[PDB]
Design an enzyme around this catalytic site. Structure first.
Site, PDB file in Angstrom:
ATOM      1  N   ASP A 139      -1.401   6.498  -6.837  1.00  0.00           N
ATOM      2  CA  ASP A 139      -2.795   6.061  -6.786  1.00  0.00           C
ATOM      3  C   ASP A 139      -3.705   7.028  -7.523  1.00  0.00           C
ATOM      4  OD1 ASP A 139      -5.562   6.225  -5.700  1.00  0.00           O
ATOM      5  OD2 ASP A 139      -4.901   4.433  -4.622  1.00  0.00           O
ATOM      6  N   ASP A 200      -8.531  -4.094  -5.501  1.00  0.00           N
ATOM      7  CA  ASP A 200      -7.573  -4.429  -4.438  1.00  0.00           C
ATOM      8  C   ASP A 200      -7.689  -5.874  -3.962  1.00  0.00           C
ATOM      9  OD1 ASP A 200      -5.617  -2.415  -3.405  1.00  0.00           O
ATOM     10  OD2 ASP A 200      -7.401  -1.139  -3.346  1.00  0.00           O
TER      11      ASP A 200
END
Ligand SMILES: *[C@@H]1O[C@H](CO[C@@H]2O[C@@H](C)[C@@H](O)[C@@H](O)[C@@H]2O)[C@@H](O[C@@H]2O[C@H](CO)[C@@H](O[C@@H]3O[C@H](CO[C@H]4O[C@H](CO)[C@@H](O)[C@H](O)[C@@H]4O)[C@@H](O)[C@H](O[C@H]4O[C@H](CO)[C@@H](O)[C@H](O)[C@@H]4O)[C@@H]3O)[C@H](O)[C@H]2NC(C)=O)[C@H](O)[C@H]1NC(C)=O
Ligand SMILES: *[C@@H]1O[C@H](CO)[C@@H](O[C@@H]2O[C@H](CO)[C@@H](O[C@@H]3O[C@H](CO[C@H]4O[C@H](CO)[C@@H](O)[C@H](O)[C@@H]4O)[C@@H](O)[C@H](O[C@H]4O[C@H](CO)[C@@H](O)[C@H](O)[C@@H]4O)[C@@H]3O)[C@H](O)[C@H]2NC(C)=O)[C@H](O)[C@H]1NC(C)=O
Ligand SMILES: *[C@@H]1O[C@H](CO)[C@@H](O[C@@H]2O[C@H](CO)[C@@H](O[C@@H]3O[C@H](CO)[C@@H](O)[C@H](O[C@H]4O[C@H](CO)[C@@H](O)[C@H](O)[C@@H]4O)[C@@H]3O)[C@H](O)[C@H]2NC(C)=O)[C@H](O)[C@H]1NC(C)=O
Ligand SMILES: *[C@@H]1O[C@H](CO)[C@@H](O[C@@H]2O[C@H](CO)[C@@H](O)[C@H](O)[C@H]2NC(C)=O)[C@H](O)[C@H]1NC(C)=O
Ligand SMILES: *[C@@H]1O[C@H](CO)[C@@H](O[C@@H]2O[C@H](CO)[C@@H](O)[C@H](O)[C@H]2NC(C)=O)[C@H](O)[C@H]1NC(C)=O
Ligand SMILES: *[C@@H]1O[C@H](CO)[C@@H](O)[C@H](O)[C@H]1NC(C)=O
Lengths: 390, 391
Positions: A139, A200
């Site tokens: 990430d 997301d």
């Protein structure tokens, strides 16, 4: 990333969307992110034949680590929620035929706040490798500039290959270079097995719509660089949850198939509908997403609250998707030119189309001249597989 | 409208959302709006016990009429799609124990374009009455000012009562006064059995969210004037269709119950899921919406993506709704003060709460002191019924 991995889209499970970052193991032990949770899901993936269907990767997202490095400087699984440590976990997972995936981060902290990996890449890589990891979701939260970023990604990449262990590398690289400068996807492809593009995802139809809408309005840059080694990753399959409807869930599965997207579930396989397990394990569809060729599909037609997507498969076969974006009314009917579909190819001059979603039916043969007509449910999708008489 | 009708919210079926205005009976017949369609839907409402559950009104929305008035000057069902005029249909409908509802319009045209009813109210009323209608959905598209409007509504109202026939009057009046002046709801209540407030509805969660949110942020003006004779009508129940998820459909039913809202389905009772038919016919919930009292519920708590709604019923009983507005994650858990719920009342001294949605469970007895805790699915809802006793 040509490391001989992900020569087909990756298939697994990721706790994020369904469990996010839950730590109250006092009042909520079952949603609480702990080696016990994964220890269970893993048993199941084998139980109700998820492994058998295709999903083989059990991946842990953010919030699995402890507050800060150990004496030696390495990372560490939270003492309370991961007492036995990853190595032992990985072991179990492996014992059951699966592969363990872990969450990391290029910046100074994970999006959760837990330790980052800046100036640790190497140490960390060896650690994961040592631990017996099979996949790293790297990430990208917390980092000065693209300098630190882009390099962190490229660096960690090499680190891993170095360790010697075969590790699938999932980057969130692109998602962060936006909006500052479109990323050089060809480059990113030389460092990742697959990357994130758009934000997301929520257990909502809106969230799915947007992802398609964005990916659609961009195939130019992405639809291309897709193929074995590296894929475009929309985000986890939120099917099995609650925000989506029947005709809505099929759409997601059907379309993730069209986009040769990594199939990563994010739901509770302990309490999941049979109607949904069915979809998710659909041999025929998994087969289209897992097509050996590796040619990402794309959006072909627009207009009339209708979307037509297609993906070329192997052996002069193509898969076509029919999404009906009309949020209201009943199931409409769309009809097109069989010919002008498989880029002219499939159906030239003999096609054998068979509905594969939502009902796996057997439509007749279709000639180059033929016209194809099928009714589509609101927010629903129709997935077809065209074969050429050759 | 005190005409002795709708002394409880009205329950029925309306083709709009599910079938809209479909006319291609050449390449899309099942969606095609024709006396044939309704005939079927009517048989079924009796078949799979929709009548038995509570739905008794079979209503036709816009696009049922023919291009223009007959010689006499009366309206007339489309020749091709409604060969047997209306009347007979009414008769088939009346046969099956059901009541027929029809669509009209105060302006010069219906939102569909078909003939209006300006300077016809009287003629039209007698006609519908004559035809044997049981309910009129008076839509408000096409009209100069509120003058023509507000009067068209009040007029037609009287017209109907005049005909002598007992006709439920569903107005879309308020929905049209904005953008001008908040409606004299008390006035509107003197002319309608129930009215539309917010815009139309899509087979989408968004559309439901918005309706609730708009309604919530307005109970002040509406939540009050609600009661026997006249109700606030959000819009048809799009349950049974496709845009809503499971947890999402329960929310709609559960909350339509809390808002003593008219229950009007708009789906195809032919290819409707069993899981959904179940919900829609839930005797326990229909019961809460149909509560004889007629006290519209409202939103009680907000914040941290959680909504708590409640409605007082009859006999010191209350119904509470727990909506979880968190679009992502897993099923969260909410806990509150049993006491401070039924305005302090329900749960003094005891309370006998029984989950009624999504699973009709039997929770124990709760004291005024007691704390209640229940997990709620994303975009889902939990409907409870509190009974006051003293065990
Ligand atoms: C349904 O549609 C009807 C038609 O309206 C549209 O516009 C016309 C021009 C056509 O293009 C038509 O095809 C369109 O659909 C509409 O009917 C109209 O109703 C209004 C309100 O009643 C009338 O307006 C008024 O007209 C008068 C002039 O004559 C009128 O009054 C006498 C006496 O009462 C009557 O006997 C006549 O039948 C007329 O109704 C005007 O005096 C008045 O205007 C005032 O201001 C003007 C301008 O500054 C001054 O000159 C005047 O002195 C006034 O002080 C009104 O404007 C309109 O004439 C009438 N049209 C027709 C063809 O009859 C109807 O209202 C629509 N219904 C709904 C619900 O929308
Ligand atoms: C560090 O980085 C280096 C540099 O990339 C990696 O080196 C690669 O190592 C892999 C390991 O397997 C090598 O992979 C092999 O590539 C062969 C080339 O074929 C490709 O192209 C043909 C023609 O288009 C395609 O048909 C085919 O699918 C491949 O895309 C393959 O033929 C090999 O075959 C595999 O599948 C067959 C069929 O089932 C099996 O029989 C084989 O056993 C095997 O599984 C294989 O994929 C790759 O060539 C190396 N690349 C380079 C540039 O040297 C290191 O692996 C990496 N280190 C670590 C630890 O990851
Ligand atoms: C046109 O409008 C007029 C006036 O607005 C309207 O008359 C009203 O009819 C209703 C219908 O009953 C009356 O309301 C009833 O009043 C009686 C006593 O006044 C009550 O007992 C009624 O409730 C009980 O009794 C009912 C009658 O049998 C039972 O069915 C019910 O279960 C209850 O036990 C109810 O409140 C109202 O009083 C009159 N209004 C006037 C001014 O008379 C008329 O019906 C309309 N015409 C048409 C054709 O619709
Ligand atoms: C993205 O990065 C790649 C990797 O370098 C660029 O492609 C290389 O371009 C150089 C020219 O400086 C060539 O010598 C290499 O052979 C190319 N590599 C490959 C694998 O083709 C590419 O040009 C960059 N994209 C953009 C838009 O700048
Ligand atoms: C809304 O309409 C009502 C009645 O249609 C208005 O109330 C009237 O107020 C007068 C004032 O003394 C009373 O004599 C009447 O008895 C009332 N009528 C009714 C039916 O109660 C009311 O004023 C209007 N509201 C607004 C804001 O104008
Ligand atoms: C991490 O934070 C420090 C402290 O300000 C900063 O100097 C460093 O550049 C940061 N690292 C990245 C990758 O942003």
């Amino acid at each position: 990333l040509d490391n001989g991995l992900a020569r087909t889209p990756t298939m697994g499970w990721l706790h994020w969307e369904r469990f996010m970052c839950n730590l109250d193991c006092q009042e909520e032990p079952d949603s609480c992110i702990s080696e016990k949770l994964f220890m269970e899901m893993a048993e199941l993936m084998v139980s109700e034949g998820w492994k058998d269907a295709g999903y083989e990767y059990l991946c842990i997202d953010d919030c699995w680590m402890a507050p800060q490095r150990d004496s030696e400087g390495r990372l560490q699984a939270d003492p309370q929620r991961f007492p036995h440590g990853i190595r032992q976990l990985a072991n179990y997972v492996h014992s059951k035929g699966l592969k363990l995936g872990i969450y990391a981060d290029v910046g100074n902290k994970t999006c959760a706040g837990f330790p980052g990996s800046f100036g640790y890449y190497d140490i960390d890589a060896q650690t994961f490798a040592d631990w017996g990891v099979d996949l790293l979701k790297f990430d990208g939260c917390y980092c000065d500039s693209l300098e630190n970023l882009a390099d962190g990604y490229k660096h960690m990449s090499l680190a891993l290959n170095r360790t010697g262990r075969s590790i699938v590398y999932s980057c969130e690289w692109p998602l962060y270079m936006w909006p500052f400068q479109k990323p050089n996807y060809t480059e990113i492809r030389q460092y990742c097995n697959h990357w994130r593009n758009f934000a997301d995802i929520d257990d909502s139809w809106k969230s799915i719509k947007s992802i398609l809408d964005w990916t659609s309005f961009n195939q130019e840059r992405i639809v291309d660089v897709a193929g074995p080694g590296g894929w475009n990753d929309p985000d986890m399959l939120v099917i099995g949850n609650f925000g989506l409807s029947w005709n809505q869930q099929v759409t997601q599965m059907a379309l993730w198939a069209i986009m040769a997207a990594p199939l990563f579930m994010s739901n509770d396989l302990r309490h999941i509908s049979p109607q949904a397990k069915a979809l998710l394990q659909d041999k025929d569809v998994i087969a289209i997403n897992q097509d050996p060729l590796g040619k990402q599909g794309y959006q072909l037609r627009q207009g009339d609250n209708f979307e037509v997507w297609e993906r070329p498969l192997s052996g002069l076969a193509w898969a076509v998707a029919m999404i009906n974006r009309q949020e209201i009314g009943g199931p409409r009917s769309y009809t097109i030119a069989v010919a002008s579909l498989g880029k002219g190819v499939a159906c030239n001059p003999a096609c054998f189309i068979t509905q594969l979603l939502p009902v796996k039916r057997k439509l007749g043969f279709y000639e180059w001249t033929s016209r194809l007509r099928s009714h589509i449910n609101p927010t629903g999708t129709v997935l077809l597989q065209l074969e050429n008489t050759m």
